[PDB]
């Protein structure tokens, strides 16, 4: 809280923090305990987790949390020195550690001073690696010094340094759990205007946090900053009346729950990566047709996420996803985009061709990175559009690395799912048959959504929706156009209303609202697209 | 160490330790014998294997055991210093050896003091290596100065430092023997009671330790540390109360046998590649269906492991491995994951794509290292999922290095086994045919598991297991539905029970137990997955 950084500061990590406490902090305080009963404590702990998640700050509170002498060193300067003086640098601090013991030897990004064992060829690199190894090895137990370190990759460190000896104790620090978030946000709130005493705010922060899967701890804190920024916009005209600072408003600044609400959206939720790109707005209500599909597609995604509780009351595992398949021109993507807009937990979309061309050696490491990123960011919806494009038949008898690399990896990686993870797969394909049936095997998809072509009646609703923006006239009547064409697909009726305009603009140079005739002419301009031949294909392939 | 490290301190390595003793220690003590009739003794030893595990401890026990003056220097600081004086550092120590001989001149991490043969471009690097070569050559016999040092690179050194007459004796120390484990843990019992001692407990701990196949020396010691930690949790509610520790319970804490057992689960598995794999959770009972497969698969993995003695009575070598193949959607992976959960031996699971982009310098060496580590950590069960994906036929040459790299390495690595390497191959593939037939040869597998699709009778058992969690109504007749459909796979029947719920929640938001009807509607929501055309394909393909 008030402290520079201390136990009372740290929070939300209580399980994980509970590791730290229970591991290094306890002996360090009363040696009497371990002195009486057996074994030596740990000599160090490595903190694994979502990169730099305020990594340092966790260990930064072991600076007032133990009273062991402070002893930060940071990776870059350790290896800098004029050749072979870098090694003696390390040792010099290490000796000063033994001198000042008990001591919090704090070095982070320890990967930097701990590359791979032998998978790096560098002289100096191997010099310091060996040294650090040895700095562990010469050992005096009298080194009642702890060595804390953090890294971006668990195994980045020399596999030797992983041993149950050299950095025996190892700590992974997880992603902020939902219930955990509250604690996190709670500390970050005790520095700015809430709403009042507001038990209601505590509850607001609760449901706020539940409104999303959350963001990283740092990001959560950035949310609070957003609120600040946002509220500062609200006060921007009032405050910006004068160059000197007004003191009248300086406590008559009040930030309230709606600010936060406006920040919750339009703060980048991106836990990580450039992965996730903007999607145009449209809500499930704003998409028309296929009420049945909607009722189920919604209930599959929404139910676990919006109401976990009743789903546990069932006790059945949540569905892992579904495929959308139908004749092209049903604007598969639009259905998809809708689910993503409304979704209370963020959606991740990585378009298929991009991954299949993705250069990272042209490796399947890319497909796997999708899932990797997803797994970390879960609860989440991964979207694969044209899953066919990323996966044909693995029943292909002639295999390239097209198939070997990605298509098979896709399989294994989908199978790769951490079962608890709230990943949901929204697949789409035009021709189901093209993919490998293993993707049409369960575990991947859980429903197979055939998209029937729109009937006249459904056309009526999509049609009404489509001309909703456009200015209609008393002359037009919609149920007429519904009855006019049934053979029209949705993609064409889109263009239909469009084309009506093209016609209409020709008729009257000054704009006028559309007439029956403006539709008629356009009816005869563009063609129907729902072919009974292709429908028969899908109708029969739904037998499969 | 502090309580004098002596031969008896070191333990478990006794077989190996007997080498050290008999090699360097013996002449050094009574040289008069060998002096009268006998060899020129050894003069240097390199300890190859998992690092620091005992490396140091070996030479640390020569420190207080023979009047050979221990003389630690560690590689990093020897070569760091102001140019051309770094080399003379070494020379000084060697000379100081000759004055004070016999002396245990100790430098470890022989790699840092001898990085490469000539491969490094480092001036000083090549300086110190050459010098060290010569420091071996200059030798006076009177300089009986043994040089112990260790490395994780068997060949970092110039071949000269290998060459007999230069570090002539070389001793590799590796994972202990089962009986050896006892010695290690036993020695650690002197530092901490399990309650007092109890020869009965000691014998229990003895077989307890054999209940785990192995750990490395360090890891074994970490196990005991874990116990400590674990037991300190046990006394944690009582301990917190105190600020001045009671003498009343100070070593009247009891580290119960169950504590050890519970540390035994959730202890580091393997010292290296501790990154290893994730975690499954299924228990053998929970594998439903395929009771027959279970009976054979279990006896293949379990037998060698559960009773070695009776298996030697057979005298047949352990089963080479087996492949699982059938129509997909038998959730191959779950069967596999299960066997691995219960098995005492390590599980290794390496998903195909991950490895397949691992071409560490266009180099398969990572797959080779998987097996390498596996070989070291043996007995273990390797699981290869989509073994096809990493092993297409060599009958396809529509590759660059893809096949060459991994498939042939796979081959040579399967061949790489030793009888004592209790690696066991649990294969899984959707389609055998994609695979290189060389892997489908004997030795590269032992059995070929065709998975017969779920029978009605087996559906019942998988079904009971599946609805076990679910609220079950008296309305349902489970044997009815089992007998109702069969073309429906198990993976789908999972979703069947799921969808039943979806139906049920829709009907009543208040969650009542599932009904026959809830299955019926859902029965027709899902469709079969098993297609007899492909089953016949695989059934017949069991011929090839």
PDB file of N, CA and C in Angstrom, chain A residues 2 63 90 181 231 248 261 305 399 507 521:
ATOM      1  N   UNK A   2       1.050   1.861   1.189  1.00  0.00           N
ATOM      2  CA  UNK A   2       1.802   3.078   1.433  1.00  0.00           C
ATOM      3  C   UNK A   2       3.283   2.886   1.159  1.00  0.00           C
ATOM      4  N   UNK A  63      12.534  -6.646  -0.657  1.00  0.00           N
ATOM      5  CA  UNK A  63      13.340  -5.477  -0.592  1.00  0.00           C
ATOM      6  C   UNK A  63      12.901  -4.806   0.662  1.00  0.00           C
ATOM      7  N   UNK A  90      30.838 -11.072 -11.851  1.00  0.00           N
ATOM      8  CA  UNK A  90      29.820 -11.875 -11.212  1.00  0.00           C
ATOM      9  C   UNK A  90      30.263 -12.309  -9.868  1.00  0.00           C
ATOM     10  N   UNK A 181      -8.253 -11.331  -9.827  1.00  0.00           N
ATOM     11  CA  UNK A 181      -8.216  -9.997 -10.376  1.00  0.00           C
ATOM     12  C   UNK A 181      -8.643  -8.958  -9.410  1.00  0.00           C
ATOM     13  N   UNK A 231     -11.505   9.821 -17.786  1.00  0.00           N
ATOM     14  CA  UNK A 231     -12.085  10.820 -16.932  1.00  0.00           C
ATOM     15  C   UNK A 231     -11.439  12.164 -17.109  1.00  0.00           C
ATOM     16  N   UNK A 248      -9.534  24.635  -6.745  1.00  0.00           N
ATOM     17  CA  UNK A 248     -10.938  24.444  -6.457  1.00  0.00           C
ATOM     18  C   UNK A 248     -11.367  23.084  -6.881  1.00  0.00           C
ATOM     19  N   UNK A 261     -16.406   1.915 -17.138  1.00  0.00           N
ATOM     20  CA  UNK A 261     -17.209   1.292 -18.154  1.00  0.00           C
ATOM     21  C   UNK A 261     -16.844   1.699 -19.555  1.00  0.00           C
ATOM     22  N   UNK A 305     -19.620 -19.196 -20.972  1.00  0.00           N
ATOM     23  CA  UNK A 305     -18.947 -17.987 -20.623  1.00  0.00           C
ATOM     24  C   UNK A 305     -19.798 -17.097 -19.780  1.00  0.00           C
ATOM     25  N   UNK A 399       2.003 -36.528 -49.714  1.00  0.00           N
ATOM     26  CA  UNK A 399       2.153 -35.546 -48.676  1.00  0.00           C
ATOM     27  C   UNK A 399       3.356 -34.732 -49.005  1.00  0.00           C
ATOM     28  N   UNK A 507     -32.329   7.242 -62.646  1.00  0.00           N
ATOM     29  CA  UNK A 507     -33.656   7.745 -62.874  1.00  0.00           C
ATOM     30  C   UNK A 507     -33.781   9.180 -62.472  1.00  0.00           C
ATOM     31  N   UNK A 521     -36.200  -3.489 -61.825  1.00  0.00           N
ATOM     32  CA  UNK A 521     -35.091  -3.313 -62.724  1.00  0.00           C
ATOM     33  C   UNK A 521     -33.853  -3.981 -62.222  1.00  0.00           C
TER      34      UNK A 521
END
